RNA sequence: GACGCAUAAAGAUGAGACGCGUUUUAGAGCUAGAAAUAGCAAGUUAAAAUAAGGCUAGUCCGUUAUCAACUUGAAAAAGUGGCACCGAGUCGGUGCUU
DNA sequence: TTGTACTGTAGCG
DNA sequence: CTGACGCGCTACAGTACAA
DNA sequence: TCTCATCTTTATGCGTCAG
């Protein structure tokens, strides 16, 4: 009758088991359908479902954004062509058509094969005149002659297409601020403004500072040594105030007009001209030299004056490349003639031919050519250019991402100013071309859809087509920016219909402070017991402490309120630890801004303050904030309004306005916040107010409050967890269906939750500011003195990484700049392409070009030898962990490898936590569907949430050891053990039922006490318990309920039952058959070839002439029975075979299968015999051999080795020889146990050999492993047992993979033949595998 | 085992952008050559595509999630498979039942 | 002309 | 006042031989 | 790789959810 279900859930597995009250697994004779002879099969009700883990939508989002970027770039080019079309039709009516056709081969082109001029001699003269595009760009910028319109279009199209980044918001004009000689009129302005007439002994410019590094510690000492110092903080020119602004908003030093806060002149210094702009030049020259220093970092130098410094630098790269190539060829020919063919012709050895024609990058070419340059003479300049990474550089390189869009904008504007007189249409629509270059859709607007995209939220004022020129008159940017946030913030849980408050809302901070404060109790010598704080006392302490300090500690509450107001000698306070967790931060911010305490304390103006904070949280754009905030200009002055628009807030709370202050009690008339302010002597907090039946909040919340697929479509989060939730809920539903529609007594779910000690939990959750303090104190820096920081600012990732690295780049020995973090780069040590790991142990803040050069690989050996001392200096200072140092020094150990790819990722842990929590919720909702008028829910099925520690201790205390390498049976065994432990726990201790059942609750540190409680509850399974004093204590062999004589655990029969279940050979292991979805092929495009396997990259692009893709992905295979037109003397020969339907042929095949199969050469196709066969489709062959269909042309192993439990225990104990960490006597018992069954190794080999000879049929590998095992049979038990554990990869279910023994490495035996399964028995397994449909394919065709 | 706050860690979801990379074409190769070729010269750039494509034709969408077999149903979705005992090499045997 | 077996390939910061 | 007992893992491409 | 935002699950500190 009664039964229970245990569940062990993972990211790729769902283990399930059915137990009775006797802890036995039932077995039933299940019906078998199909045309086979077998009509009934015996199966045990225990098993595991295996499936591929669900993928996150990160890669799909990246592909979608790349698609949109390509579409918008093509549209920019189309707009430029639309402007140029009518004028280009005069001079060359087929120019744009030749540019469109330029991909095509000569026989496919409708026009002449030369794109630009349409004839050979003019094209050759063009390429001689302008070797690169940058020569043409510099010619069009600098010269004044009338040029051909085609060349102007080519330069403007190259500028618009590759337009540079938008991380700089200013103008940054390169026409006059590019030059470094602005220092001389800076000191002319210094002489004019500062009325002392100083001597302008002008020395070297910022080139002297840039010679070593752009830093204060170089600049200040350099220009104080060069020109004599009259004022250290008030030198008034080329200062750190004017180049790289200070970290805090500190006042001006030696002010000229007023004392105002100073910062970097990027975007937050515009308001810092209130010294003169608010009271009506050195600051204009400061802006000019800021532009000069920024652009001198971006671009190296221009010696001869020009308005195109980027093109000049690119031409300098071309000229130096030409000179160095000529010199290198001469030196190689003169000194190493045999190496000339390898370097300059053979393009596969990473030479110059491999650097240009081949696929070798710049650093591969440098590391190949560095020894060659070292052995040769006369290579000193080439060596010093290689060390600077400046030798033989290209123009289109990886480090061009540092160029802002303003440089390209300046060069384009220069070209249009040169050519406007000759071409009137350039002057007519110069602003349109500049807008095409400079327009960028705001991130708060999103896609420009018209109601057909599920990603778009933008609303438009009119139904016209959106262009970069009419974007402001069509797109409603305020509503789109509001909907950007309102579509993304969650709703209130208690009131599901309306939105939550901002985190920094004044009402939210008030509610949080009063919720924390209303349960604070104080005691003294006056009275007998601690008493709650009254409403008057709470109001007084809020006014005295919470509105005068941003953070208030309990010590301040002792000595400033109770010592003076209602004077007591000493008071003991409970309800709070050393500091209050709540604070009125927004009140202090608005007191600092508005300078009006009475305005904030006033009651009637509370709503407008709420709307102000809502505006400051929703919006961050200055014009939108001023658009929303101009309503309140009649209360606030203009200066204070300009200051208040700067107060950016980010983050939202969990409660709404209606919950905390909107709804009122029907009898009292008070809101929840009103009750928190004063509730008489009850002093109820938020949960009491929403749970007390006396107040009417409870049923108001109750009045505020289907298919499973719709029950899961509405849950937010990652889509990866929905797969596991679907699988386990379908497994539970099928298990309920198996037992005749009877629900279990209880369902036990293994959760990844834990319990750990109070000091361990607090040590793992300390502030990262403390980490910074002890690390920097240990390594003895003064970085916190120069750049102060609080804990809330380290929540930013880049600032946290800057402080972790002690202000220095950890790939190159140079200092970082705290104010320029937008251009620095956050880098993963182990790259994203290899392993998914976003830990703080895997993250570096480094310079951008060093990260881009260090692509898709571990950082190389040279940087390890350069900065390995600094990595050790940070390592012993506890600033980086040992794992981080191991990742940084990984290239010393061979770099990336297949061993490094193995092991679990922490995303799997987070995913399984999310999964099991949602499974507990959904199973509790589904199973208990009945309720009464007095009983709010009838617990028909008890969802029990066990923790993994209990099952792990049960395995490790009674020798039920688990190893994962042998078979996939451990999931089912874990499910069975979870069910046994959960049912025994709820049977043994009925008073602790509310502790373990979902939805129920029972109501030295608390966590330590709970950890000891959870450790001690497991003792009743044991026969003898060793106490902490080292003295044993006995328990009865038969356990009972205690309150009742009912029997809950017999340490005789039940342990034998559990041993029998764990040794059962038949376990229903099911691999989920899945139709493959995703990308059609591997993304690489291969060159042209005569093969037919190449896939066309476009409809009209024949891959025989244009190349194409390879490795197509088969969605599912299809069994076809038809005739094939085989033979020169053609006959219709009948055949039965699999055909792989790929992903892009999936829709075409499902549209009309007969026509698709007829196009493939088949004919007389049997339509009803078409069988869809997804991946991992299961076939059974002779002697119980099973194969899983990996593809139409490859199979997989499908059998599971049911090794006896004694061998598994021997393998677990033989390995981990001296790391059990139990007791010494236990260790010696397993020592003798493994030594006097050392012969079990031979029996394990015999078992593996028999299983492999029955089902694997890898005979050559079998002889290899037998020879290798015989040749090292004299090694110690440790390494032998460890590699017998490795040895099960040959017999493991799934795809074959290369394992390794002691020293031999066994290559996998691939099953690259699906011919045999065409006459095997096809098995259609249900989600549990109990229901089967066995189809004998030999009877078809 | 849930809620509010504080401090952690490890992760998700959406938008806007950049720089490369790959592929075909353009950038006249010269000489000795019956030649299979050999010597020499040159190399840095540009156009186009960047999932085939789709229709509601948008400066939109197209790699996430769904998916054993059979019977109904456009689809959504619904339905279909006896029990007890003795045993165990991937499940077998024995006995009642319609 | 068709099956096998061994080794290499695979978008990224 | 209320419980005891103190999580993971390869299909196809290219070349070279057996018939 | 950059810039913007919004969440989630676990660990500790405090309070609470009741017959
Ligand atoms: Mg588990
Ligand atoms: Mg990287
Ligand atoms: Mg598992
Ligand atoms: Mg998929």
Is strand B in 7 Å reach of the CB of A123?
yes
Which residues have a beta carbon within 5 Å of ligand 2, which is an ion?
A 827
**Residue with token string 């039940």:** A1054
Helices A606-618 and A622-629, axial angle in degrees (round to 10): 160
- Could you tell me the CA-to-CA distances from A36 to A33, A39, A1323, A1325, A1337 in Å, in that order? 8, 8, 11, 15, 10
Q: Is residue A750 annotated as involved in ligand binding?
A: yes
Q: How far is the C-alpha of A805 from the C-alpha of A775, rounded, in Å? A: 10
CA angle A43–A46–A49, rounded 5-degree value = 105
* Nearest residue to A93 (alpha-carbon basis) of A167, A149, A174: A149
Residue nearest to nucleotide D14 (CA to C1'): A1091
Separation CA A496–CA A484 (nearest Å): 20
φ/ψ (deg, to 5) at A774 = -70, -30
Catalytic residue among A588, A828, A918, A973: A828
Nucleotide nearest to A791 (CA to C1'): B7
Q: What is the Cα–Cα distance from A890 to A65, expressed in whole angstroms? A: 33
The token pair that represents A1159 in the structure block:
């196009």
Residues bordering ligand 1, an ion, CB closer than 5 Å: A 8, 750
| CA to C1' distance (Å), from A704 to B56 | 38
Nearest one of A213, A60, A53 to A905, comparing CA atoms: A53
Distances (CA, A) of A394 to A157, A164, A319, A1236, A1332: 20, 17, 11, 70, 63
Taking the C-alpha atoms of residue A1281 and residue A1216, their distance in angstroms, rounded to an integer, is: 9
The answer to whether the CB of A1178 falls within 8 A of the CB of A1186 is yes
> Which distant-in-sequence residues (6+ apart) come within 8 Å of A1239 by Cβ?
none
SS3 call for A876: coil
A1050 C-alpha to ligand 3 centroid (Å): 27
Residue A1272, annotated as binding a ligand: yes
* Interatomic CA distance for residues A231 and A419, integer angstroms: 49
For B2, which residue's CA is nearest its C1'? A999
**What are the backbone dihedrals phi and psi of residue A1321, each rounded to the nearest 5 degrees, phi first?**
-95, 120
Report CA(A22)–C1'(C8) in Å, whole number.
56
Asked whether strand B has any atom less than 7 Å from the CB of A926, the reply is no
Distance set, CA A665 to CA A539, A694, A1164 (Å):
22, 10, 79
Task: Check whether A957 is labelled as a binding-site residue.
Answer: no
Question: End-to-end alpha-carbon separation of chain A, Å?
Answer: 47
> Per the structure block, which two tokens stand in for A304?
């001869």
How many angstroms separate the CA of A1194 from the C1' of C8?
A: 18
How far is A568 from A318, CA to CA, in rounded Å?
83
8 Å CB contact between A1318 and A1137:
yes
- List the A1289 CA – D16 C1' distance (angstroms): 29
What is the rounded CA–CA span in Å between residue A493 and residue A67?
Answer: 37
For ligand 2, the distance from its centroid to the CA atom of residue A784, given in whole angstroms, is 28
| Through-space separation of residue A394 CA and nucleotide B28 C1' in angstroms | 25
Residue pair A732/A923 in contact by the 8 Å Cβ criterion: yes
Is there contact between A1016 and strand D, defined as CB under 7 Å from any strand atom? yes
CA distances from A614 to A625, A643, A650, A1194, A1331 (A): 11, 17, 10, 60, 58
A13 has which bridge partners? A50
Using a 7 Å cut-off to protein CB atoms, list the covered nucleotides of chain C: 2-7, 9-13
Q: Using the C1' atom of nucleotide B44, identify the protein residue whose alpha carbon is closest.
A: A394
Q: Are A1322 and A1306 in contact (CB under 8 A)?
A: no
Per-residue buried b or exposed e for A1188-1214, using 16+ beta carbons within 10 Å of the residue's own CB: bbbbbebbbbbbbbbbebebbbbbbbb
Q: What values do phi and psi take at A140, rounded to 5?
A: -70, -30
Please tell me whether A797 is known to bind a ligand: no
Q: Tokens for A1189, please give them.
A: 């269909």
Q: Quick one: tokens of A597?
A: 């305490």
For ligand 4, the distance from its centroid to the CA atom of residue A1188, given in whole angstroms, is 19
Listed residue (A390, A229, A191, A382) closest to A300, CA to CA: A390
Tell me how far CA of residue A752 lies from CA of A50, A235, A908, in angstroms. 19, 62, 11
Residues A889, A864: contact at Cβ < 8 Å? yes
Alpha helices, DSSP H only, in A235-339? 240-243, 282-298, 309-335
Dist. CA A1140–CA A1145, nearest whole Å: 9
Query: Hey, how many other C-beta atoms are within 10 angstroms of the C-beta on A1244?
Result: 22
Q: Hey, is A227 helix, strand or coil?
A: coil
Q: Which two tokens stand for residue A1124?
A: 């094939």
List beta partners, residue A1096: A1108
Residue–nucleotide distance: A914 CA to B11 C1' (Å): 10
What token pair was written down for A82? Answer: 């639309």
Close Cβ partners of A1128 (under 8 Å, ≥ 6 residues apart): none
Decide if A8 is catalytic. yes
CB-based burial label for A42 (10 Å; 0-12, 13-18, 19+): exposed
| DSSP conformational letter for A1019 | G
Q: Which helix (H) or strand (E) holds A329?
A: helix A309-335
What does DSSP assign to residue A546?
Answer: I
**Integer CA distances (angstroms), A227 to A179, A230, A231, A896, A1075, in order:** 21, 9, 11, 53, 75
Q: Which of A1296, A1302, A1262 is nearest to A1282 (CA)?
A: A1302
Closest ligand by atom to A1115 CA: 4
How many CB atoms sit inside 10 A of residue A601's CB? Answer: 12
Which residue stretches of A748-791 are H helix? 758-763, 768-779, 783-786
Ligand nearest to the CA of A15: 3
Tokens of A30: 């299940």
Tell me how far the alpha carbon of residue A46 lies from the centroid of ligand 3, in angstroms. 13
Question: Residue A1263: CB partners within 8 Å, gap ≥ 6?
Answer: none
- The CA distance from A151 to A139, in Å, is 10
Residues 6+ apart with CB under 8 A from A1340: A1119, A1121, A1136, A1169
The Cα A538–Cα A519 span in angstroms is 11
A28 Cβ within 7 A of any nucleic strand B atom: yes
Burial class (CB in 10 A: 0-12, 13-18, 19+), A195: exposed
Q: Are residues A1211 and A1197 in contact, defined by beta-carbon separation less than 8 angstroms?
A: no
Residue A368 CA distance to nucleotide C4 C1' (Å): 39
* Ligand 2 centroid to residue A214 C-alpha, Å: 25
A306/A1200 Cα distance (integer angstroms):
75
Q: Which one, of A1154, A1192, A1159, A1156, lies nearest residue A1173 by Cα?
A: A1192
- Give me the sign of the Cα torsion angle A617, A621, A622, A623: negative
Give phi and psi for A864, each to the nearest 5: -65, -45
Question: Ligand 2 centre from A833 Cα, in Å?
Answer: 9
A665 CB neighbours strand B below 7 A: no
* Rounded CA–C1' distance between A34 and B69, in angstroms: 9
Q: Can you tell me which residue has its alpha carbon closest to the C1' of nucleotide D4?
A: A1017
Cβ of residue A856 lies below 7 Å from strand C: yes
Q: Give the span between the Cα atoms of A484 and A443, in whole angstroms.
A: 9
Structure tokens at A892: 């010393």
SS3 A1187: strand
| Strand B contact with A1149 (CB < 7 A) | no
For residue A1336, give the H/E element and its range.
Answer: strand A1332-1336
Distance CA A1218, CA A1241 (A): 19
Q: Which ligand approaches the C-alpha of residue A858 most closely?
A: 2
Neighbours of A1046 (CB within 10 A): 9
CB-proximal residues (5 Å) to ion ligand 3? A 8, 10, 13, 15, 971
3-state secondary structure of A571: coil
């Amino acid at each position: 009758k009664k039964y229970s279900i245990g569940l062990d859930i993972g990211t790729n597995s769902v283990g399930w088991a059915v137990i009775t009250d006797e802890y036995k697994v039932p077995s039933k004779k299940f019906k078998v359908l199909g045309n086979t002879d077998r009509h009934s099969i015996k199966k045990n009700l225990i098993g595991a479902l295996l499936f591929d883990s669900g993928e996150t939508a990160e890669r799909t989002r990246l592909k979608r954004t790349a698609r949109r970027r390509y579409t918008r770039r093509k549209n920019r080019i189309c707009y430029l062509q639309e402007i140029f079309s009518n004028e280009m039709a005069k001079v060359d009516d087929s120019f744009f058509h030749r540019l469109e056709e330029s991909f095509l081969v000569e026989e496919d082109k409708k026009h002449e094969r030369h794109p630009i001029f349409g004839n050979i001699v003019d094209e050759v003269a063009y390429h001689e005149k302008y070797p690169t595009i940058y020569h043409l760009r510099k010619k069009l910028v600098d010269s004044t002659d009338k040029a051909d319109l085609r060349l102007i279009y080519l330069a403007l199209a190259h500028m618009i297409k590759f337009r540079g980044h938008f991380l700089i918001e200013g103008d940054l004009n390169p026409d006059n601020s590019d030059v470094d000689k602005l220092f001389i009129q800076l000191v002319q302005t210094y002489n004019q403004l500062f009325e002392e007439n100083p001597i302008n002994a002008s020395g070297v410019d910022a080139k002297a500072i840039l010679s070593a590094r752009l830093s204060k510690s170089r600049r200040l000492e350099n220009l104080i040594a060069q020109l004599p110092g009259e004022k250290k903080n008030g030198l008034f020119g080329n200062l750190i105030a004017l180049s790289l602004g200070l970290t805090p908003n500190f006042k001006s030093n030696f002010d000229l007009a007023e004392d105002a806060k100073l910062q970097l002149s990027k975007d937050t210094y515009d308001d810092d001209l209130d010294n003169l702009l608010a009271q009506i030049d050195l600051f204009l020259a400061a802006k000019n030299l800021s532009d000069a220093i920024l652009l001198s970092d971006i671009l190296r130098v221009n010696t001869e004056i020009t308005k195109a410094p980027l093109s000049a630098s690119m031409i300098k790269r071309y000229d130096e490349h030409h000179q160095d190539l000529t010199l290198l060829k001469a030196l190689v020919r003169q000194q190493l003639p045999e190496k000339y063919k390898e370097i300059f012709f053979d393009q596969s050895k990473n030479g110059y031919a491999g650097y240009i024609d081949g696929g070798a990058s710049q650093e591969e070419f440098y590391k190949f050519i560095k020894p060659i340059l070292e052995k040769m003479d006369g290579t000193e300049e080439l060596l010093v250019k290689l060390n600077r990474e400046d030798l033989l550089r290209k123009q289109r390189t990886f480090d061009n991402g540092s160029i802002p869009h303003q440089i390209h904008l300046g060069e384009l504007h220069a070209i249009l100013r040169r050519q406007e007189d000759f071409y009137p249409f350039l002057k007519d629509n110069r602003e349109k071309i500049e807008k095409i270059l400079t327009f960028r859709i705001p991130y708060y607007v999103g896609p420009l859809a018209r109601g057909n995209s599920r990603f778009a939220w933008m609303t438009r004022k009119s139904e016209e087509t959106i262009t970069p020129w009419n974007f402001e008159e069509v797109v409603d940017k305020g509503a789109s920016a509001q909907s950007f946030i309102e579509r993304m913030t969650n709703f209130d849980k208690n009131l599901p219909n309306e939105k939550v408050l901002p985190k920094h809302s004044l009402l939210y901070e008030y509610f949080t402070v009063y919720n924390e404060l209303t349960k604070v109790k104080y005691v003294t010598e006056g009275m007998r017991k601690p008493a709650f704080l009254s409403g008057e006392q709470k109001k007084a302490i809020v006014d005295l402490l919470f509105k005068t300090n941003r953070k208030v500690t309990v010590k301040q509450l002792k000595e400033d309120y109770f010592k003076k107001i209602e004077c007591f000698d000493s008071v003991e306070i409970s309800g709070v630890e050393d500091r209050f967790n709540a604070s009125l931060g927004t009140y202090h911010d608005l007191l600092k801004i508005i300078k009006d305490k009475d305005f904030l304390d006033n009651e009637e103006n509370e709503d407008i303050l709420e709307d102000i904070v809502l505006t400051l949280t929703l919006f961050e754009d200055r014009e939108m904030i001023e658009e929303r905030l101009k309503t309140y200009a009649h209360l606030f002055d203009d200066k204070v309004m300009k200051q208040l628009k700067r107060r950016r807030y980010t983050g939202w709370g969990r409660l709404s306005r209606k919950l905390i202050n909107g709804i009122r009690d029907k009898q009292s008339g008070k809101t929840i916040l009103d009750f928190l302010k004063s509730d008489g002597f009850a002093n109820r907090n938020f949960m009491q107010l929403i749970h007390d039946d006396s107040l009417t909040f409870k049923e108001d919340i109750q009045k505020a409050q289907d298919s499973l697929h719709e029950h899961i479509a509405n849950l937010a989060g990652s889509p990866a967890i929905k797969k596991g939730i679907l699988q386990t809920v379908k497994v539970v539903d099928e298990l309920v269906k198996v037992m005749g529609r009877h629900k279990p007594e209880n369902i036990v779910i293994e959760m990844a939750r834990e319990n750990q000690t109070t000091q361990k939990g607090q040590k793992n959750s300390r502030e990262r500011m403390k980490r910074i303090e002890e690390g920097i104190k240990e390594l003895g820096s003064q970085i916190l003195k120069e750049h102060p920081v609080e804990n809330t600012q380290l929540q930013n990732e880049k600032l946290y990484l800057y402080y972790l690295q002690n202000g220095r780049d950890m790939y190159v020995d140079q200092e970082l700049d705290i104010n320029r973090l937008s251009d620095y780069d956050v880098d993963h040590i182990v790259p994203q392409s290899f392993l998914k790991d976003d830990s703080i142990d895997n993250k570096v803040l480094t310079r951008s070009d060093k990260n881009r050069g260090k692509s898709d690989n571990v950082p190389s050996e040279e940087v390890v030898k350069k900065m390995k001392n600094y990595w050790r200096q940070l390592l012993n200072a506890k600033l980086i962990t040992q794992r981080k140092f191991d990742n940084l020094t990984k290239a010393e150990r061979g770099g990336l490898s297949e061993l490094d790819k193995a092991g679990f990722i922490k995303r799997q842990l987070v995913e399984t936590r999310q999964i099991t929590k949602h499974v507990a919720q959904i199973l509790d909702s589904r199973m208990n569907t009945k309720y009464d008028e007095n009983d709010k829910l009838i617990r028909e099925v008890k969802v029990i949430t066990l923790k993994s520690k209990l099952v792990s201790d049960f395995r490790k205390d009674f020798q039920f050891y688990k190893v994962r390498e042998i078979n996939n049976y451990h999931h089912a065994h874990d499910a069975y053990l979870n069910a046994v432990v959960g049912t025994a726990l709820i049977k043994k201790y009925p008073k602790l039922e509310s502790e373990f059942v979902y939805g129920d609750y029972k109501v030295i540190g608390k966590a330590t006490a709970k950890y000891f409680f959870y450790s001690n509850i497991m003792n009743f399974f044991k026969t003898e318990i060793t106490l902490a004093n080292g003295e044993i204590r006995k328990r009865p062999l038969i356990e009972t309920n205690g309150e009742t004589g009912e029997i809950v655990w017999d340490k005789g029969r039940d342990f034998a039952t559990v041993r029998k279940v764990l040794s059962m050979p038949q376990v229903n292991i099911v691999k989920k058959t899945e139709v493959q979805t995703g990308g059609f092929s591997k993304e690489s495009i291969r060159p042209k070839r005569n093969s037919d396997k190449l896939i066309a990259r476009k409809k009209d692009w024949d891959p025989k002439k244009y190349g194409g893709f390879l490795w197509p992905t088969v969605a599912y295979s299809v069994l076809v029975v038809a005739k094939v037109e085989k033979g020169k003397s053609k006959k219709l020969k009948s055949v039965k075979e699999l055909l792989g339907i790929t992903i892009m042929e999936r829709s075409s095949f499902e549209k009309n299968p007969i026509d698709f199969l007829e196009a493939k050469g088949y004919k007389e196709v049997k339509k009803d015999l078409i069988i869809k066969l997804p991946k991992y489709s299961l076939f059974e062959l002779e002697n119980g051999r099973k194969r899983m269909l990996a593809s139409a042309k490859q199979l997989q192993k499908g059998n599971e080795l049911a090794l006896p439990s004694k061998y598994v225990n021997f393998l677990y104990l033989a390995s981990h020889y001296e790391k059990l960490k139990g007791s010494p006597e236990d260790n010696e018992q397993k020592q003798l146990f493994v030594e006097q069954h050392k012969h079990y190794l031979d029996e394990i080999i015999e078992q593996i050999s028999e299983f492999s000879k029955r089902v694997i049929l890898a005979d050559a590998n079998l002889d290899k492993v037998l020879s290798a095992y015989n040749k090292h049979r004299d090694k110690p038990i440790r390494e032998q047992a460890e590699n017998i554990i490795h040895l099960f990869t040959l017999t493991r279910l799934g795809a074959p993979r290369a394992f390794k023994y002691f020293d031999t490495t066994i290559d996998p035996k691939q099953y690259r033949s699906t011919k045999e399964v065409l006459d095997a028995t096809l098995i259609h397994q249900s989600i549990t595998g109990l229901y089967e449909t066995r189809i004998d394919l030999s009877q078809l065709g």
